[PDB]
Swiss-Prot record, chains A, B:
Binding positions for Zn(2+) 1 per the UniProt entry: 46, 48, 67, 174
Catalytic activity: a primary alcohol + NAD(+) = an aldehyde + NADH + H(+); a secondary alcohol + NAD(+) = a ketone + NADH + H(+)
Keywords in alphabetical order: Acetylation, Cytoplasm, Metal-binding, NAD, Oxidoreductase, Zinc
Protein name: Alcohol dehydrogenase E chain
Xref: Gene3D superfamilies: Medium-chain alcohol dehydrogenases, catalytic domain, NAD(P)-binding Rossmann-like Domain
Species, as recorded: Equus caballus (Horse)
Record keyword Cell inner membrane present: no
Length: 374, 374
């Protein structure tokens, strides 16, 4: 039994920006009150984990990254009531405390206990459960899933179906839920509408899935890598366009194609220029544009507010607008009942020990999601 | 008899930017097919008319400005079916053709026949009905209400109750409808919510009226002119703040006052900086901010898109989101049935010959709405 004891295990530690991960031994403390220690089973490689390496997404270093994952509870701290040893779980990078003004609001999901807005890289109590080479290591988004074992606060974990295939449903911990919810919950895509989706990676393909589920008549995929078009069409895109093929700006192209602007547009990349382009291509009187991508830290965009005065709506969201702990178990149940598919997002599988090759695949443009198995 | 003949009458001509209006004789041609010639009875002085003088709003000069008014039909051109000679009418600076994609959409109101996006300063047929000293004079937003007689396209006029008081209901042609609709239709203010309103002129006071009608619990007025506060409280503000009284940015003040950000905020001034401040002060996960003010031509704002990624919604609108020809007659009927008040907006009632004095009252901070009577 390991309950109440320190666990020594392997993790992928990031000591420095712009360097490979280091797979080495870490010490994982036992859970304190209202904490849960999880044996990880599978984790996806999401572009936000790469943003930590590139310095796009700022969080304290050294760190154990990873936020899209699934595993099995090893032990629970005092007072935990929502999970037990042996349960299958998904860590929640957006917590759901259930008690703050956001958690009590009908639409809000960005719980005030989050570690996203002004990151500390700690547990809720301001301390760390990890040491490596005798030095304390930061957490990432309260989850730190690039480790054989992690410790999370109870408000950052959801119990899921015991029969769930963890190597698939890890994607409900970030990319699938974010893109799908951005379409069905945040934008509220309507039947018969025209949508434009900028960026055709795992999250943008999930936005396409949600637009098709909502009954859109036209779904235009936009990417500078034409090798992403075939899979976009498989999951519902009706047409795809590469901005590099055109002499005019793509907002003009899209407005012409849609006979005056699209109903719904989505930025699913992380660039300031494509956020403004995506807003401009929606119809000026009644269009809606949703920002999903994460841009380089602390940088401001420039835009003309007359784009809004005519009638456009501009919004963003984290995790598809879903209240995390209520929604994740229901999304897994819907997956088990074949209400949506996850296999189209999975292009590569590797053992955890080959995490750096998995990041190389993402950076080269070759992969959508690589799933790592422990 | 004036029907079918050129009319000579007085108008306020603006020959160049940054000069007083010239009150002099103009010639007004008879209406062509699908056009309506109107004898003006009352017109309000709105800040957007002043924006033409100051160069904030670019439109072809020389011009007859004025867009908030009410009058009586003098004659109709061939083919007109919606008004007749002797009817009371309000000119519509946002048209409603009924046939374009926007007019057919459930939410949109920015009809594609508008002269707001890329102003030509003409009738729909690309010509002008006004001459002055032998020279052609431009129209303004298809309305040109600063003249004893004007000619408007049929899609730019609504028939209203024959018993309505024209010296009051002229406000339904711009300021009342814009502010009220921005609250009740565009933002969709909810019962029990907290609202912040930036700018306490005629339009901002109308936003307050709409927030109170919608059941808001708290309505915080924001203005650098504290002389505006008493009237704001009379029409529903619960508190008023002056940014110049504080050592920290007003977005921080308003976030603290609202225990973490307001539900709804409104920019009703026309400044880039207050547009970004108003967005920032709404709650980061579920707040909504609406731009109503018109800022200086061709100038971009700078903002951090993380303000939207957390969950905020940013939108703007023209004319409160109301489909103009359908809505104006109903708003007049609602006024006649005592559903809202217009008197609180009116501080001064002057003859038309005093237009320049009326603009000086607005610029000095001393008036809300001056109504000019012909
Ligand atoms: N808001 C949230 O809650 C949330 C959660 C999921 C991920 N993220 C963000 O979502 C974004 C997408 O993540 P992903 O894992 O799908 O990434 P990804 O890298 O797999 O996909 C991005 C796609 O954008 C395309 N692209 C890059 N530059 C482009 C340009 N200039 N024009 C057009 N296309 C361009 C790429 O070719 C690529 O296919 C990232 O910024 C990530 O950080 C946000
Ligand atoms: N979107 C539309 O359809 C629409 C229709 C109505 C008018 N407009 C615009 O609405 C705005 C308001 O019009 P109005 O007639 O009520 O104007 P107004 O001049 O009567 O009122 C503006 C108010 O803003 C306050 N103000 C100015 N600078 C400020 C600052 N830095 N901080 C705080 N308060 C400040 C002033 O003291 C004043 O009370 C204008 O820009 C006008 O052009 C837009
Ligand atoms: Zn919470
Ligand atoms: Zn992610
Ligand atoms: Zn129309
Ligand atoms: Zn106006």
């Amino acid at each position: 039994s390991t309950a109440g004891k320190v666990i020594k295990c392997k993790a992928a530690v990031l000591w420095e920006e712009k360097k490979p991960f280091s797979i080495e031994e870490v010490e994982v403390a036992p859970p304190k009150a209202h904490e849960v220690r999880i044996k990880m089973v599978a984790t996806g490689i999401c572009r936000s984990d790469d943003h930590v390496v590139s310095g796009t997404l700022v969080t304290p270093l050294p760190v154990i990254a990873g936020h899209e994952a699934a595993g099995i509870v090893e032990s629970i701290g005092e007072g935990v009531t929502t999970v037990r040893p042996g349960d299958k779980v998904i860590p929640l990078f957006t917590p759901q405390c259930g008690k703050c003004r956001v958690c009590k609001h009908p639409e809000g999901n960005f719980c005030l206990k989050n570690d996203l807005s002004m990151p500390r890289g700690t547990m809720q109590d301001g301390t760390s459960r990890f040491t490596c080479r005798g030095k304390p290591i930061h957490h990432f988004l309260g989850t730190s899933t690039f480790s054989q074992y992690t410790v999370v606060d109870e408000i950052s974990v959801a119990k899921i179906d015991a029969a769930s295939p963890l190597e698939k449903v890890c994607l409900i911990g970030c990319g699938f839920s974010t893109g799908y919810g951005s379409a069905v919950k945040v934008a509220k895509v309507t039947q018969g509408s025209t949508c434009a989706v900028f960026g055709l990676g795992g999250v943008g393909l999930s936005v396409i899935m949600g637009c098709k589920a909502a009954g859109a008549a036209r779904i235009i995929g936009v990417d500078i890598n034409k090798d992403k078009f075939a899979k976009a069409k498989e999951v519902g895109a009706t047409e795809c366009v590469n901005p590099q093929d055109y002499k005019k700006p793509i907002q003009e192209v899209l407005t012409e194609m849609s006979n005056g602007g699209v109903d719904f547009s989505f930025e699913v990349i992380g660039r300031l220029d494509t956020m403004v382009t995506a807003l401009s291509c929606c119809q000026e009187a009644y269009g809606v544009s949703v920002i999903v991508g994460v841009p380089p830290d602390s940088q401001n965009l420039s835009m003309n507010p007359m784009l809004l005065l005519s009638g456009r709506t501009w919004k963003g969201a984290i995790f598809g607008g879903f209240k995390s702990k209520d929604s994740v178990p229901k999304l897994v149940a819907d997956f088990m009942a074949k209400k949506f598919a996850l296999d189209p997002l999975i292009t590569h599988v590797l053992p955890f020990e080959k995490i750096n090759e998995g990041f190389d695949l993402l950076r080269s443009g070759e992969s959508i999601r690589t799933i790592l198995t422990f």
